C-alpha cells in the first residue's frame, strides 16, 4: 500500500558494471580498489536475494548495449531492478573504458513507458563516480515515465568522489555495511541516510598533496520513488 510489492517470485536483477582499466588514449587512470567494491556489492546483493550479474571493463558501446538488452528482458516475475555503476565520471556522465556516456541514456531504457515489465517497480541506480572536480574541505490512470527511480550517488553534484586503493570506495564500503546491518530493519531511504552519515563522519582523505589532503564527502540520494522500499 505505502510499500512497494516485494514478494514477486524474484527480487530482481542486480547489474554491476565494474570499470577498472581504461583505454590508454582516454588518459583515464586505473581505478585501484574497485574490485573490492564489485565483490562486496555482489555478496551484499546476493544476500538480499538479487540475481547479480557482474560485468568488467565495458566500452561505452557495450554499456549501452547491455542496458538495452537488460531493459528488453521480461521482468514480470521480478520485484525490482538494480544497476550499480563503478567508473570515472563527471556531472551526468559515466565512463566506458573508451570514453564517456550520458547517464540519462543508460537510465532511459528503463523509463516507465520503455520497460513495461518494470512499470510501477523500483529502479535503483547506484553510482560510484565523480560528478566534477570540487573538493569538500569540511568544517570543524497514468504514472510519470520518470517515476519509481532512485539514484544513489556517491557524492554531491559538482564534486569528486573518493576511492581507497586498498579498501574500495568510501560510498560502496559504507553502502554494503549499512545494507548488511540494516536491510532487515530499515526502509531503504533510512538505510541510505545512515550511509550518508557514515561517509560524512568516518572518512577523510589522506594525501601527500595538500590540495587533496583532509577532504570530506557527502553522498547524494535522489528519489523519484512513490513508495517505501523494504528488502524483507
Amino acid at each position: 500500500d505505502n510499500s512497494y510489492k516485494m514478494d514477486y517470485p524474484e527480487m530482481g536483477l542486480c547489474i554491476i558494471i565494474n570499470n577498472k582499466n581504461f583505454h590508454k588514449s582516454t588518459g583515464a587512470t586505473s581505478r585501484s580498489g574497485t574490485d573490492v567494491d564489485a565483490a562486496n556489492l555482489r555478496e551484499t546483493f546476493r544476500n538480499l536475494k538479487y540475481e547479480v550479474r557482474n560485468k568488467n571493463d565495458l566500452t561505452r558501446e557495450e554499456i549501452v548495449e547491455l542496458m538495452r538488452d537488460v531493459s528488453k528482458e521480461d521482468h514480470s516475475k521480478r520485484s525490482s531492478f538494480v544497476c550499480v555503476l563503478l567508473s570515472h565520471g563527471e556531472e551526468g556522465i559515466i565512463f566506458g573504458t573508451n570514453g564517456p556516456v550520458d547517464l540519462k541514456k543508460i537510465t532511459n531504457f528503463f523509463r516507465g513507458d520503455r520497460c513495461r515489465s518494470l512499470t510501477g517497480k523500483p529502479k535503483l541506480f547506484i553510482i560510484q563516480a565523480c560528478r566534477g572536480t570540487e573538493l569538500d574541505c569540511g568544517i570543524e490512470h497514468k504514472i510519470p515515465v520518470e517515476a519509481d527511480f532512485l539514484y544513489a550517488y556517491s557524492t554531491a553534484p559538482g564534486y569528486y568522489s573518493w576511492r581507497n586503493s586498498k579498501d574500495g570506495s568510501w560510498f560502496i564500503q559504507s553502502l554494503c555495511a549499512m545494507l548488511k546491518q540494516y536491510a532487515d530493519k530499515l526502509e531503504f531511504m533510512h538505510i541510505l541516510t545512515r550511509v550518508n552519515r557514515k561517509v560524512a563522519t568516518e572518512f577523510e582523505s589522506f594525501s601527500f598533496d595538500a590540495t587533496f589532503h583532509a577532504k570530506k564527502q557527502i553522498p547524494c540520494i535522489v528519489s523519484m520513488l512513490t513508495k517505501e522500499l523494504y528488502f524483507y
Partner: peptide, 4 residues
C-alpha cells in the same frame, strides 16, 4: 585515497 584517490578520486574517480
Amino acid at each position: 585515497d584517490e578520486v574517480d
